[PDB]
């Protein structure tokens, strides 16, 4: 249906790209000497055609609800859409487009109290670098100066970085809206780079967790607890991650039961009772194991894993995002469900 | 010569663009079916040609030291370089490239205490919107909760937005390094959108946002000194024009004025000179040496002759570009909120 409208991810003043009520995305670009121009979204290349105004224009098929990385192909060159905002993901800075969702209210910008997203730079002795992190502080962090807060360490997937959760993830807005409705306790969120994207060729294990585990446990957690008003005890520290960041969370939390008490794995593995080296300490220390994925992924793995944990007396929850796959809508919804269960 | 190296503004792992010791920029892109590919930088479209490996590659003439907006043109399509970081400027999100500078240390990431750049969302009754601002807080802001800090309101130019000063301006690093050397007093910096990009400009919408909404929000939510001796405003280009209009209309709110490549104040512009001298501790005006520095000299002289604390600064070998404004701020910040 011809009800295309500017998307919310358009650069200021840009009328294209557009999205219609079906979720189709319409891209447009001026390229007056080009010959072959395509829209690359959802894993498909859609031919674009020159209209009466000379500009190339073309429609995708209906996209899943939520956020999608995409690009244009201009006579063979893969390039970001000049009309849209840019995000780091798919291992590039590039265009993303927002497709309206039936449940999009939970990440809307509302007139409610808003927390801050604070960019910090922390020294990393194990890597000889100064490293970026983004820290969400809840809306009344600056008012209640005697109050101290739990902390969630929240990680991105392969091809992403420390900006993912606060931009395409809209995590600050999800928190602001949950806190306003009384559905989540206020807590701090720390987002850093998970050291996931630099290609390596180890043969002992597929991924060596030690570099990032050292940065997180030995450097970032002490920095956060020293510089923010946190509750720095095990029941008030959690970790979650998506995709490879969920694999990192799984390995780091299971190896540091004295530091983390809630575990969130979004499209990033599961924990089964037989996986746990010491089930007794696990049962006493871990208050929540949460696993999630999109309905287009492999949710069938969840029932045996959750059952195995519940049979061992371990609090386990699974969640499936309907009609989505390995994309940010799955992870926004996962976080929205997970956040409501933390630090009860 | 052929000593090109990846620039510090490349996307992770990307080997292009590159810059050589002269300040030439080299761009490269795969476009297997293209016929005409250009590097657009410094107002010049430079031809890129297919090398042996099929990729298009081409060099600019030497660029001034510092940061430069640029783009590529592929068979007529103006696009950001897939290989560089992106910045908001020239009224788009698009490519920028960093050319090494002899004095780049002052905006380097050093082993010093670091402040925070805090993104806030404040409500605006006059526009019925929730608006973004970025707030730099100095390194030890969180250590003593009894201390309160002066505030600088710092504005971008036309075609830019609230991200400019903390990204391409590297303002947090400039402050961190100045504070570490004891050359600047710690203060807070507030950067919001100046409502410039949407012909006598109507200052009222932004003045209302800044004066009636953002200043009260900041003083109510950050540990600030909310009196006029501890509030400053500065801006570059059209943001300097906005600064001139707003500060001159609100002498009871601002005591220090910075205008970077953005107009001047002459003694004749001042309605009451005696009170201006009472209220205003600094009028700082700057530009790049390639702009028209001479133009500013009569105006600054007229202020000094009238006993007004007016200072001028000229950035060597730069034009209407961010290196001028980084250096301007570096000099200006050392003069703010003196004891």
3-state SS of B268-294 is: HHCCCHHHHHHHCCEEEEEEECCCCHH
User: Left, alpha or beta for A298 (phi > 0: left; psi -120 to 50: alpha)?
Assistant: beta
Which residue, among A319, A312, A172, A316, has the nearest Cα to A242 in the 3D structure? Answer: A319
Chain A segment 60-119 residues within 8 A of B by beta carbon are: 72, 74-80, 82, 85-86, 91-94, 109-111, 114, 116-119
Nearest-angstrom CA–CA distance, B186 and B60: 40
Distance CA A76, CA A34 (A): 10
How many whole angstroms separate alpha carbon B6 and alpha carbon B13?
A: 10
* B11 reaches A (C-beta below 8 A): yes
Q: Residue for token digits 């061992």?
A: A312
Contact of B7 with B98, CB cutoff 8 Å? yes
Contact A34 B198 (CB under 8 A): no
Tokens 């490996």 belong to residue:
B53
A35: contact with B, CB 8 A cutoff: yes
Nearest to A25 by CA among A87, A86, A96, A79: A96
CA B310 vs CA A88, A332, B153, B283: distances in Å: 44, 52, 19, 5
Residue A98's φ and ψ, nearest 5 degrees, are -100, 120
Phi, psi for B68 (deg, rounded to 5): -140, 130
Closest CA to B232 of B180, B191, B178: B191
DSSP string, A113-159: ---EEEEEEEEETTTTEEEEEEEEE-TTTTT-TT--B-EEEEE--TT
State the DSSP H helix or E strand holding residue B132, giving kind and residue range, or none if neither.
Answer: strand B129-137
Q: How many residues does chain B have?
A: 339
Among A336, A342, A129, A133, smallest CA distance to A228 is for A133
B150, B188 in Cβ contact below 8 A?
yes
Per DSSP, the three-state class of B224 is: strand
Shortest distance, CA B110 to any CA of chain A (angstroms): 8
Q: Does B33 touch chain A (CB under 8 A)?
A: yes
Helix (H, G, I), strand (E, B) or coil at B100: coil
Tokens 């068979």 sit on residue: B75
A76: nearest CA partner in chain B: B31
> Residue B25: enclosing H or E segment and its boundaries?
strand B25-29
Radius of gyration of chain A measured on its C-alpha atoms:
21
Q: How far is CA A258 from CA A266, A284, B41, B78, B242, in A?
A: 22, 11, 54, 54, 55
Helix (H, G, I), strand (E, B), or coil: what is residue B179? helix
Contact between residue A94 and residue A80 where contact means Cβ atoms under 8 Å apart: yes
What resolution in angstroms, rounded to 1 decimal?
A: 1.6
Sign of CA dihedral A155, A158, A160, A162: positive
d(CA A212, CA A248): 8
Query: Residue B245: helix, strand or coil by DSSP?
Result: helix
Burial class (CB in 10 A: 0-12, 13-18, 19+), A125: exposed
Per the CB < 8 A criterion, the answer to whether B180 and B333 are in contact is no
Q: Is A140 on the interface with B (CB under 8 A)?
A: no
Contact call for residues B27 and B72 (beta carbons, < 8 A): yes
d(CA B288, CA B314): 5
- Token pair, residue B233, equals 């405003």
């Amino acid at each position: 249906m011809e009800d295309f409208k500017p998307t919310s991810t358009n650069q200021p003043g840009r009328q294209y790209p557009q999205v219609n009520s079906e979720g189709r995305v319409r891209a447009r670009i001026e390229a007056p000497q080009a010959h072959t121009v395509l829209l690359d979204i959802g894993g498909v290349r859609y031919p674009m055609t020159q209209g009466e105004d000379g500009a190339w224009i073309g429609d995708s098929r209906p996209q899943d609800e939520g956020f999608h990385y995409y690009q244009l192909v201009i006579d063979g060159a893969r390039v970001p859409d000049p009309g849209s905002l840019y995000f780091f993901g798919a291992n590039r800075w590039g265009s993303g487009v927002e497709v309206p969702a039936h449940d999009q209210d939970f990440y809307a910008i509302k007139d409610v109290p808003h927390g801050r997203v604070q960019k910090i730079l922390f020294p990393s002795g194990s890597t000889s670098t100064i490293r970026r992190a983004f820290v969400y502080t809840p809306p009344d962090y600056g008012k209640d100066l005697s109050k101290r807060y739990p902390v969630l360490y929240l990680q991105h997937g392969w091809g992403e970085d420390e900006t993912g959760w606060a931009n395409q993830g809209r995590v600050n807005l999800i928190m602001d809206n949950l806190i306003a409705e009384g559905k989540a306790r206020p807590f701090i969120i720390v987002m850093t780079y998970g050291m996931t994207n630099e290609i390596r060729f180890g043969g002992i294990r597929e991924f060596d967790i030690r570099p990032f585990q050292t940065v997180l446990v030995d450097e970032l957690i002490p920095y956060i607890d020293a510089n923010f008003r946190t509750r720095s005890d095990q029941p008030h520290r959690a970790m979650a991650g998506l995709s490879m960041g969920g694999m990192e969370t799984r390995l780091i939390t299971m190896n540091n039961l004295d530091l983390f008490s809630h575990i969130g794995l979004f499209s990033g593995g599961t924990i089964s009772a037989s996986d746990i080296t010491d089930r007794d300490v696990f049962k006493q220390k871990i208050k929540l194991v949460f696993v999630s994925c999109g309905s287009r992924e492999n949710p069938g793995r969840f029932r045996p894993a959750v059952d195995s944990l519940q049979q061992a007396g371990i609090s386990a929850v699974s969640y499936v995002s309907p009609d989505t796959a390995h994309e940010w809508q799955t992870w926004r919804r996962s976080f929205y469900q997970f956040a409501q269960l933390l630090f009860q």
